[PDB]
Amino acid sequence: SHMAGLEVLFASAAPAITCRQDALVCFLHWEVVTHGYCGLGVGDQPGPNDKKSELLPAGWNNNKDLYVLRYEYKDGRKLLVKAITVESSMILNVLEYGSQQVADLTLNLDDYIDAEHLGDFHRTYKNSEELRSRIVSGIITPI
C-alpha cells in the first residue's frame, strides 16, 4: 500500500524537473495531495491563477532555492508549504493557515535524489519508503 500517481505527476511535470530539489518537491507534492489535499497555487498570497488542482502550479519550480506552494484540503484546513534549499539539503516548513500550527523537517538531497537519474523516474528516488514515512510522520500527521 502506497498510492498511485507519483510516476504520472513526475511525467506531467517532466520538462520542469531539472534539479534534485525539483524531484524532492515533486515527491512532496504528491504526498500532500494523496493525503487529502488539492494544490491551490504558487506564492503565499493568492495570485490570479489559483486553480484548485492535483498538478503542480505553473511556476512551481522557478526558484530553485525556495519553493512556495499553497494547498487546500478536500473538505475544510488550508496550507502554506515552504521547501527551503540549504547546501545539500532542504528544509520543509509548513503552516496550517488557520491554527498557525507549524511542521518541520530536514532532508538530505544526497540520500534521497539521484541527479544522475533525474531523466528516469524509476531511479530518481533513492529511498522512496523512508522518505514517504518521514514526510507523512513529520509533516502530514500534524494536522
CSV table of C-alpha atoms in Angstrom, one decimal:
chain,number,residue,atom,x,y,z
A,1,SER,CA,0.0,0.0,0.0
A,2,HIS,CA,1.3,3.3,-1.4
A,3,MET,CA,-0.9,5.4,-3.6
A,4,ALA,CA,-0.5,5.5,-7.4
A,5,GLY,CA,0.3,8.7,-9.3
A,6,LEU,CA,3.8,9.9,-8.4
A,7,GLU,CA,5.1,8.5,-11.8
A,8,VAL,CA,2.3,10.4,-13.5
A,9,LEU,CA,2.9,13.6,-11.7
A,10,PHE,CA,6.6,13.3,-12.4
A,11,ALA,CA,5.7,12.6,-16.2
A,12,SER,CA,3.3,15.6,-16.2
A,13,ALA,CA,6.0,17.9,-14.7
A,14,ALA,CA,8.9,16.2,-16.6
A,15,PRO,CA,10.0,19.3,-18.6
A,16,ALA,CA,10.1,21.1,-15.2
A,17,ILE,CA,12.2,18.5,-13.2
A,18,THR,CA,15.8,20.0,-13.7
A,19,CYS,CA,17.5,19.8,-10.2
A,20,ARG,CA,17.4,17.4,-7.3
A,21,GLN,CA,15.3,19.9,-5.5
A,22,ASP,CA,12.6,19.8,-8.2
A,23,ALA,CA,12.3,16.0,-7.7
A,24,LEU,CA,12.3,16.4,-4.0
A,25,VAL,CA,9.4,18.9,-4.1
A,26,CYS,CA,7.6,16.8,-6.6
A,27,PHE,CA,7.5,13.8,-4.3
A,28,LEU,CA,6.4,16.1,-1.5
A,29,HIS,CA,3.5,17.4,-3.6
A,30,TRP,CA,2.1,14.0,-4.3
A,31,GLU,CA,2.1,13.1,-0.6
A,32,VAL,CA,0.4,16.2,0.4
A,33,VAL,CA,-2.1,15.6,-2.5
A,34,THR,CA,-2.7,11.9,-1.8
A,35,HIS,CA,-3.5,12.7,1.9
A,36,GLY,CA,-6.5,14.9,1.4
A,37,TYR,CA,-5.1,17.9,-0.3
A,38,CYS,CA,-5.6,19.8,-3.5
A,39,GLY,CA,-2.9,22.2,-4.6
A,40,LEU,CA,-4.0,25.8,-5.0
A,41,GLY,CA,-1.1,27.8,-6.3
A,42,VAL,CA,2.4,29.2,-6.0
A,43,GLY,CA,3.5,32.1,-3.8
A,44,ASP,CA,2.0,32.9,-0.3
A,45,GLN,CA,-0.9,35.2,-1.2
A,46,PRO,CA,-3.4,34.1,-3.9
A,47,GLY,CA,-2.3,35.3,-7.4
A,48,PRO,CA,-4.9,35.5,-10.3
A,49,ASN,CA,-4.4,31.8,-11.4
A,50,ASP,CA,-5.4,29.9,-8.3
A,51,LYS,CA,-6.9,26.7,-10.0
A,52,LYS,CA,-7.8,24.0,-7.4
A,53,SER,CA,-5.7,21.1,-9.0
A,54,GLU,CA,-3.8,18.0,-8.5
A,55,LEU,CA,-1.0,19.2,-10.8
A,56,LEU,CA,2.0,21.3,-9.8
A,57,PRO,CA,1.0,25.0,-10.1
A,58,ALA,CA,2.5,26.9,-13.0
A,59,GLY,CA,5.9,28.2,-12.0
A,60,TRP,CA,6.2,25.9,-9.0
A,61,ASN,CA,10.0,25.4,-10.0
A,62,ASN,CA,11.1,28.9,-11.0
A,63,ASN,CA,13.1,29.4,-7.9
A,64,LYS,CA,15.4,26.5,-7.1
A,65,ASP,CA,16.3,27.8,-3.6
A,66,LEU,CA,12.9,28.3,-2.2
A,67,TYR,CA,9.6,26.6,-3.2
A,68,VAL,CA,6.3,28.3,-2.1
A,69,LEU,CA,3.1,26.3,-2.5
A,70,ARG,CA,-0.4,26.6,-1.3
A,71,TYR,CA,-2.7,23.7,-0.7
A,72,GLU,CA,-6.3,23.3,0.4
A,73,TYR,CA,-7.8,20.2,2.0
A,74,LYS,CA,-10.5,18.0,0.2
A,75,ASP,CA,-13.3,19.0,2.9
A,76,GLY,CA,-12.1,22.0,5.2
A,77,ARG,CA,-7.7,23.1,6.6
A,78,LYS,CA,-5.7,25.3,4.2
A,79,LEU,CA,-1.8,25.1,3.8
A,80,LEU,CA,1.4,27.1,3.1
A,81,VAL,CA,4.3,24.8,2.2
A,82,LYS,CA,7.9,26.1,2.0
A,83,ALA,CA,10.8,23.9,0.8
A,84,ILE,CA,14.0,25.9,1.6
A,85,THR,CA,17.3,24.7,-0.1
A,86,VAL,CA,20.3,24.7,2.3
A,87,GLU,CA,23.6,23.3,1.0
A,88,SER,CA,22.8,19.7,0.1
A,89,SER,CA,19.5,19.7,2.0
A,90,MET,CA,16.0,21.1,2.1
A,91,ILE,CA,14.1,22.4,5.0
A,92,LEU,CA,10.4,21.7,4.8
A,93,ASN,CA,8.3,24.0,6.8
A,94,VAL,CA,4.5,24.0,6.6
A,95,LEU,CA,1.8,26.3,8.1
A,96,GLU,CA,-1.9,25.3,8.6
A,97,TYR,CA,-3.2,28.8,7.5
A,98,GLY,CA,-5.9,28.7,10.3
A,99,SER,CA,-4.5,27.2,13.5
A,100,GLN,CA,-1.0,28.7,13.0
A,101,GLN,CA,0.2,25.0,13.7
A,102,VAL,CA,3.7,24.5,12.2
A,103,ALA,CA,5.7,21.4,10.9
A,104,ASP,CA,9.4,21.0,10.2
A,105,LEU,CA,11.6,18.5,8.5
A,106,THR,CA,15.0,18.5,7.0
A,107,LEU,CA,16.0,16.1,4.2
A,108,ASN,CA,19.4,15.3,2.7
A,109,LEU,CA,19.1,15.5,-1.2
A,110,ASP,CA,22.4,13.3,-1.2
A,111,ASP,CA,20.3,10.5,0.4
A,112,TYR,CA,17.0,10.8,-1.5
A,113,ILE,CA,17.5,12.1,-5.0
A,114,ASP,CA,19.9,10.9,-7.8
A,115,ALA,CA,21.0,13.8,-10.1
A,116,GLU,CA,22.3,11.2,-12.4
A,117,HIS,CA,18.9,9.7,-12.8
A,118,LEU,CA,16.6,12.7,-13.0
A,119,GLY,CA,15.6,11.8,-16.5
A,120,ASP,CA,14.4,8.4,-15.3
A,121,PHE,CA,11.6,8.3,-12.8
A,122,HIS,CA,12.5,4.7,-11.8
A,123,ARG,CA,15.9,5.6,-10.5
A,124,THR,CA,15.4,9.2,-9.4
A,125,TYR,CA,14.3,8.2,-5.9
A,126,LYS,CA,16.9,6.6,-3.7
A,127,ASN,CA,14.7,5.8,-0.7
A,128,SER,CA,11.1,6.1,-1.6
A,129,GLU,CA,9.8,4.3,1.5
A,130,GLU,CA,11.8,6.1,4.3
A,131,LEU,CA,11.2,9.5,2.5
A,132,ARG,CA,7.5,8.7,2.4
A,133,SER,CA,7.4,7.9,6.2
A,134,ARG,CA,9.5,10.8,7.3
A,135,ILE,CA,7.2,13.2,5.3
A,136,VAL,CA,4.0,11.6,6.5
A,137,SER,CA,5.2,11.2,10.1
A,138,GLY,CA,6.7,14.7,10.2
A,139,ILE,CA,4.6,17.0,8.1
A,140,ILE,CA,1.2,15.4,7.2
A,141,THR,CA,0.2,13.8,10.5
A,142,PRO,CA,0.3,17.2,12.5
A,143,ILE,CA,-2.9,18.3,11.0
